[PDB]
């Protein structure tokens, strides 16, 4: 977050691995500070020593000069004449360096030793401890355990560390058939028992691990070490890595720091990931309980395609008061990068209160120069997303740069208040120091109390003219604070924009008062204290006619800038702003909405309905007009729409058009989700406190015999954010049954003149001509009513005879449509081959009656009865009836006995009709 990228660079002799192991040096006897860097393959001036190695301490400022430390200058001691006791050549001296105050500890893992008992070359290893003045040699593994089964191959010093109480920790991975070992000693004892003439010194206070069963061979315990108290006794307990344990799964052992008992065992998840390559212990969450970090450089993750890829992993095991750890995993970012090779605690890097850690990927990045990731701790644990990425800047020379292969931190080299980082790049023989920039936190308090501007409030005068404009105010405040060394005053350059949303290329409508500009800037000073350095100004709007984007709010925008150049220290170290800072804070205002004080208009959406008709006759399918008015007497509504529902049997004919005193509408129909809803638009905006009377036309094709009324629902909806929709309302009208059958009847001819031409009396007739003129009848019947009826009866009465003399004679009848007929007397009873007027009819004449059944008739369905008859000329030609005019009368009736719509009220319908035939004389007696 805050490490610089203009660091101090150190270089060593070519091919010396300078930078393999690095750390700081903090003497208590001097104010100055120095770095320490190891060069395991550097040549030295010792007699006959080839690539002996050396550790160099480099000044911070004196031209970055690096100078060797003169640990020793002797050659191989001789156990006897031309019988070397030790082989310092290629001993890798300086492979690991640790320091604590005036104490420096360096080790030579490959130092070879010829045991007294038998001349041999065993890589026992050694370490040199240098106090402020005195120098001694610490080789715990150089013992009588000459054989490989003992400690001959301890390689003591492969890793080292210091405890709080000045107790050394040293690991040798080769002891006991490469099981490994872990040896600790008191510094005071080490610097008080050294003797050049004694090669295997037997320390008293030392404690160390011991041999185990052969099943544990090739475990490499001690490959990496760290320290931190987990027992809770206040004394540091040893952490170590065992990369080959558990069938190459890898394990991490924690040993009690007081008597060397075992406390915990961590086990790797994947084979050959080399879990435990490097370990570290630091409190990443500021709980005062030290957490554990374990690296698995070769862990193979598998991506989306499922192919395993080598990216590396680091395991974070938070400590908990209960004694158990909480674990999470952190994978690498690139293939073959070997993420997790080095894990160096940084201490509270940004002084935010939580310790931070850096993890290295020495073979990643572009051109594989190496990359280092910085992670920031927090109360919940480690932040899984790196906040910074340092990168290499050198190319390989027969060797990968390996930038980040070894690191160190948690020491404030320049006393700027923050720790720093040393990164080793032994691949290119370099060491680089990154200085931590002081972190400055800032706060912005922009606010605008005239959040809604009334155009009428033209209180402020336009500068340079008497014209007054509606004005508006802006206030912005800053304050800065940070830990460590910082100037007591800081210069901030800030920017303001009034209608930034129009930066798309449109004309801005808001302008600053005095500057008459849409944007403004200020260069101001703050005293790095808690006092807010607020500032205020005035801004105004363009005239009302100049814009119409009332709904679009004005956007107020701010930015601030540090003058890093002026805030840098004597060494040119710029400060830096904290990570999570909204450097682009903003506000807004509403040109102005209709409801005034409130943007969100809350319409009181309301509706009332009226009906032209109150009952619907089934089967009529006649249009009916429904009247509805939308009022919404409350606040205004935007994009208000009317919703109406009708059943499947109903259809929306459309909007009413024949009414001039009734408002029209735009309407449509919807069936989405198998619905039957009508949609109409009221308007946008629907004005508050208004009433809009309209009407609609509908028709129902109802034919069911079970339904009795219609269901009709209505609702109003708008786009308003609050009080969006009106409550549902309904209307009701009942179904009705109206079947209307008709009977008319007809006769042809309707009158006759006597005597019949060429007619004469006979004893008895046999054909039509023996009787007289033909008379025909048609009794049509149809249901003119909208509703259907199931059963009806038809009746006819006929004046057959008067005074035992026939008047009209029926020959035959025919039926059309669904009817059947029966007669009380045999039709064609004689089976014949097919002035004042007196009235005759069934009331006085012998009456023949006919009844017919009628089936169901729907709207307009009809059946017809046809009848043919003859006029009896004999009766009128008889002496007693001569010269007298006669009128013959007949009557008919019907009844609707049943209806199909049983669920609705039903009643019978009846009526009657009459038909007549007239007889007169043409050849009348002389007057």
């Amino acid at each position: 977050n805050l490490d610089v990228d203009s660091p101090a660079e150190y270089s060593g002799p070519e091919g010396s691995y300078f930078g393999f192991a690095v750390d700081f040096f903090v003497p208590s006897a001097s104010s100055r500070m120095f770095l320490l860097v190891g060069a395991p393959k550097a040549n030295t001036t010792q007699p006959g020593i080839v690539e002996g190695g050396q550790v160099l301490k480099c000044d911070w400022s004196s031209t970055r000069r690096c100078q060797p430390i003169e640990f020793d200058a002797t050659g191989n001691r001789d156990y006897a004449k031309d019988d070397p006791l030790e082989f310092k050549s290629h001993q890798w001296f300086g492979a690991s360096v640790r320091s604590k105050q005036d104490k420096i500890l360096a080790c030579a893992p490959l130092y070879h030793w010829r045991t007294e008992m038998k001349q041999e070359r065993e890589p026992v290893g050694t370490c040199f401890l240098q106090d402020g003045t005195k120098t001694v040699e610490y080789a715990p593994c150089r013992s009588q355990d000459i054989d490989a089964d003992g400690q001959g191959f301890c390689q003591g010093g492969f890793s080292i560390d210091f405890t709080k109480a000045d107790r050394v920790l040293l690991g040798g991975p080769g002891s006991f058939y490469w099981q490994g070992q872990l040896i600790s000693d008191q510094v005071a004892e080490i610097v008080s028992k050294y003797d050049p003439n004694v090669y295997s010194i037997k320390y008293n206070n030392q404690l160390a691990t011991r041999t185990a069963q052969a099943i544990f061979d090739d475990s490499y315990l001690g490959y990496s070490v760290a320290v931190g108290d987990f027992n809770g006794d206040g004394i540091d307990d040893f952490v170590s890595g065992v990369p080959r344990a558990a069938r190459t799964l890898g394990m991490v052992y924690i040993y009690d720091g007081k008597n060397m008992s075992s406390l915990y065992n961590f086990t790797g998840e994947q084979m050959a990931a080399y879990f435990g390559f490097s370990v570290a212990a630091t409190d990443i969450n500021g709980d005062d309980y030290a957490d554990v970090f374990i690296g698995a450089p070769l862990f193979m993750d598998r991506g989306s395609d499922g192919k395993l890829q080598e990216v590396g992993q680091v395991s974070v095991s938070l400590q908990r008061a209960s004694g158990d750890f909480q674990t999470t995993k952190l994978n690498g970012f690139e293939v073959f990068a070997r993420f997790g090779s080095a894990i160096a605690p940084l201490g509270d890097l940004d002084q935010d209160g939580f310790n931070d850690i850096a993890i290295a990927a020495p073979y990643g990045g572009e051109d594989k120069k190496g990359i280092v990731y910085i992670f920031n701790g927090r109360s919940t644990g480690l932040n899984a997303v790196p906040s910074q990425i340092l990168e290499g800047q050198w190319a390989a020379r027969s060797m990968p740069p390996s930038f980040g292969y070894s690191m160190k931190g948690a020491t404030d080299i320049d006393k700027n208040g923050y720790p720093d980082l040393i990164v080793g790049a032994f691949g290119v023989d370099r060491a680089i120091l990154y200085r931590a920039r002081p972190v400055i936190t800032v706060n912005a308090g922009l606010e605008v109390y005239p959040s809604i501007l009334n155009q009428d409030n033209k209180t402020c005068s336009l500068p340079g003219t008497a014209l007054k404009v509606s004005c508006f105010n802006v206030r912005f405040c800053l304050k800065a604070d940070g830990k460590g060394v910082l100037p007591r005053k800081l210069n901030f350059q800030v920017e303001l924009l009034l209608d930034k949303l129009k930066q798309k290329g449109a004309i801005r409508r808001a302008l600053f008062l005095y500057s008459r500009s849409p944007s403004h800037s200020k260069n101001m000073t703050i005293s790095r204290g808690g006092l807010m350095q607020c500032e205020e100004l005035i801004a105004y709007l363009r005239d009302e006619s100049e814009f119409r984007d009332k709904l679009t709010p004005i956007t107020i925008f701010m930015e601030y800038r540090l003058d890093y150049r002026t805030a840098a220290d004597t060494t040119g170290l710029q400060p830096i702003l904290n990570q999570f800072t909204p450097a682009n804070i903003s506000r807004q205002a509403h040109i102005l909405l209709d409801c005034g004080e409130d943007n969100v208009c809350k319409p009181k959406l309301e509706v009332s309905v009226d009906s032209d008709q109150k009952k619907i006759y089934i089967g009529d399918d006649n249009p009916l007009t429904l009247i509805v008015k939308a009022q919404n007497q409350g606040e205004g509504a935007y994009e208000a729409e009317l919703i109406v529902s009708i059943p499947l049997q109903a259809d929306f004919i459309g909007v009413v058009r024949n009414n001039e005193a009734l408002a029209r509408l735009s309407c449509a129909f919807k069936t989405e989700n198998q619905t039957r809803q009508v949609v109409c638009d009221l308007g946008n905006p629907m004005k508050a406190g208004t009433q809009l009377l309209a009407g609609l036309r509908f028709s129902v094709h109802q034919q069911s015999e079970m339904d009795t009324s219609v269901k009709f629902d209505l609702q109003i909806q708008s786009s308003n954010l609050f009080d969006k929709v009106s409550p549902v309302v309904s209307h009701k009208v009942d179904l009705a049954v109206l079947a209307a059958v008709e009977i008319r009847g007809v006769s042809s001819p309707d009158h006759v003149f006597l005597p019949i031409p060429n007619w004469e009396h006979k004893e008895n007739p046999e054909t039509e001509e023996d009787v007289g003129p033909v008379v025909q009848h048609i009794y049509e019947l149809r249901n003119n009513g909208p509703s259907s009826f199931s059963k009806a009866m038809l009746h006819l009465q006929w004046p057959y005879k008067y005074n035992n003399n026939t008047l009209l004679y029926i020959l035959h009848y025919d039926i059309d449509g669904p009817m059947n007929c029966t007669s009380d007397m045999e039709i064609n009873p004689l089976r014949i081959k097919i002035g004042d007027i007196h009235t005759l009819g069934c009331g006085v004449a012998q009456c023949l009656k006919i009844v017919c059944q009628v089936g169901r008739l729907d709207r307009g369905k009809s059946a017809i009865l046809y009848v043919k008859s003859l006029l009896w000329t004999e009766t009128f030609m008889n002496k007693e009836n001569q010269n007298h005019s006669y009128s013959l009368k007949s009557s008919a009736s019907f009844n609707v006995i049943e209806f199909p719509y049983k669920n609705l009220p039903i009643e019978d319908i009846t009526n009657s009709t009459l038909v007549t035939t007239n007889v007169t004389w043409g050849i009348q007696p002389a007057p």
Binding site: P297, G505, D651
Partner: protein
């Protein structure tokens, strides 16, 4: 209602192609104003977009090269093919996908190459004696399984450096076994012995001149030998068109990467061939062991199938290792290697028994899935391999490919191949998108008023603050260009509330129930009356609320016909001249006449 292709309001063909695969773009200049420019091909085609102007790219998969799967092979190679099809042309839209199938068959008699990599720690003296005749016996056994065979050899102990090496008194430098009073070769990292050859008896003649060596610690540096056996192809003679077997016989666990740091070795393994004219491994003493991740990469690259022929006491360890390296298998090598031959044959048998696919060079923007049909007419979604195949069987896979966005480079090619086979299927992808009407855009031509926009696909994509199909409107210009009677009546809204006016012209936005029209958005084609649930009874065309009935229909709803056939009487005249035909029925005006044709009286 309207689809996302329309409602999303994309103003460019390229945008529409990214909206959804189903969207289609019209470049017709004669497109009516307000007509949906881009929409589902069905709707837009119903709007009679000219085929000469319709733009609708569609994903496709065309096979470019297809040799038939070989049946016997093993002779006159002539492109012995084991995968079909070999080359496919693929193209896709930002949100499209396609299905193509790959067929895999394992030729029965395919050639074989066997390289015998034998650990030579001191415990292997008995094994070395035992396998002296492995040559001829192996040839006779394999001849039952393939007609052409090649055999090689190689040995490895460990890096010749302390702490592994015996740097004990000088005798150990020239005879590490002098401690037990025996003679053996000074240890070594890896020595190539015999290049692969058809002459089998050379294997016997060479293996009988070898000797064991001795190292200090238990783990052995085999992985160096494996890497060198994979990458040094020309020294060892791996064939192009053949099956590759690497037999790795050892009786002890192995060193892994980062184990070299105990010695003075820190430099990783770059994975290159360092075997010189001398058949030894030069970089043994200056270079760490190879990681498993690198070994798998090299094995997959070189098409090597590696068999772990390890002893009983470490079978579990190498089984767990092989679980991480695709294509490997493990067998129980007896303590004296008496059963190495049968182990090799059985390992070959169960290595040919499985087919698995690898995808390489796949771009990030693409992603694909698999369906397997291994043992019968069955489908196993997801699985990429088969577990019970018999030599000579045929297998099929179905591949589904998916894409995101139109990438920056329009063409990319990747390879899909089965594990361990030279044969491969290379799929070359031709990515969308572009449109013909956009390739011919006119930069700031006067087709757009005074410029102010670039013409393309019939529409000027206007510049900053410019609006309209011809950039006739500008937000900045809207301030001076005060609107004048956007609607005919002062006090009424500038337009019908369905829209607003810019520079005196109304914009109707959008509608779901139909198309908006009119000078003031006051007319459309969906507000007319309905009859029997159909607007204008389906016998007329709506226009601004009026049903324009067809010639055969009349009335407000167009529900009544003017047809004469049903009203014509037998005399050839309508209603017998006594009435007028209405709604298909006659209404009689002559007194006394009635009926549908005025035929009754």
């Amino acid at each position: 209602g309207p689809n996302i292709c329309t409602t999303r309001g994309v103003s460019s063909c390229q945008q529409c192609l990214a909206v959804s695969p189903m969207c289609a773009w019209c470049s017709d200049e004669a497109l009516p104003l307000g007509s949906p420019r881009c929409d589902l091909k069905e709707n837009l085609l119903k709007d009679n977009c000219a085929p000469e102007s319709i733009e609708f790219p569609v994903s496709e998969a065309r096979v470019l090269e297809d040799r038939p799967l070989s049946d016997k092979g093993s002779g006159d190679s002539s492109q012995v093919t084991q995968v079909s099809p070999q080359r496919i042309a693929l193209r896709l839209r930002p949100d499209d996908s396609k299905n193509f199938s790959i067929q895999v068959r394992q030729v029965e008699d395919y050639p074989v190459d066997i390289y015998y990599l034998m650990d030579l720690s001191y415990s292997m003296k008995d094994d070395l004696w035992s396998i002296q005749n492995l040559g001829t016996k192996l040839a006779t056994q394999m001849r039952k399984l393939t007609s052409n065979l090649r055999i090689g050899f190689g040995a490895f102990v460990d890096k010749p450096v302390s702490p592994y090496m015996y740097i004990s008194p000088p005798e150990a430098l020239e005879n590490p076994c002098y401690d037990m009073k025996t003679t053996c070769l000074p240890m070594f990292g890896y020595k190539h012995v015999l290049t692969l050859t058809d002459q089998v008896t050379r294997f016997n003649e060479e293996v009988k001149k070898q000797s064991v060596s001795r190292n200090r610690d238990a783990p052995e540096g085999g992985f160096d030998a494996i890497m060198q056996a994979t990458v040094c192809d020309e020294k060892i003679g791996w064939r192009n068109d053949a099956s590759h077997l690497l037999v790795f016989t050892t009786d002890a666990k192995t060193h892994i990467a980062l184990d070299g740091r105990l010695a003075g070795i820190v430099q990783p393994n770059d994975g290159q061939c360092h075997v010189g004219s001398d058949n030894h491994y030069s970089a043994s003493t200056t270079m760490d062991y190879p990681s498993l991740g690198l070994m798998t990469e090299k094995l997959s690259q070189k098409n090597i199938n590696l068999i772990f022929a390890v002893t009983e006491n470490v079978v579990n360890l190498y089984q767990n290792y092989s679980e991480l390296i695709p294509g490997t298998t493990v067998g129980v090598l007896s303590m004296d290697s008496s059963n190495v031959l049968q182990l090799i044959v059985d390992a070959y048998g169960k290595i040919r028994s499985k087919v698995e696919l690898e995808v390489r060079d796949l771009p990030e923007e693409l992603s694909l899935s698999f369906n397997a049909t291994c043992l019968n007419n069955e489908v196993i979604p997801g699985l990429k391999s088969c577990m019970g195949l018999k030599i000579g069987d045929t297998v099929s896979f179905s591949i589904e490919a998916k894409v995101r966005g139109c990438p920056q480079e329009k063409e990319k090619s990747f390879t899909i191949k089965p594990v361990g086979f030279k044969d491969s299927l290379i799929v070359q992808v031709t990515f969308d998108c572009d449109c013909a009407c956009q390739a011919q855009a006119e930069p700031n031509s006067h087709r757009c008023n005074n410029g102010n926009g670039t013409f393309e696909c019939g529409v000027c994509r206007c510049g900053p603050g410019w609006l309209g199909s011809q950039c006739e409107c500008s937000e900045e210009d809207y301030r001076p260009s005060q609107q004048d009677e956007c609607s005919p009546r002062e006090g009424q809204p500038v337009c019908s509330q369905r829209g607003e006016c810019l520079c005196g012209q109304c914009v109707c936005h959008s509608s779901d129930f139909g198309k908006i029209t009119g000078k003031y958005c006051e007319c459309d084609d969906f507000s007319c009356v309905r009859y029997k649930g159909e607007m204008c009874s389906g016998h007329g065309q709506c226009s601004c609320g009026d049903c324009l009935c067809d010639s055969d229909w009349t009335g407000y709803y167009c529900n009544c016909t003017t047809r004469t056939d049903t009203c014509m009487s037998s005399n050839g005249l309508l209603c017998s001249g006594r009435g007028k035909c209405e709604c298909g029925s006659c209404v009689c005006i002559q007194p006394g006449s009635y009926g549908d044709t005025c035929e009754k009286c």
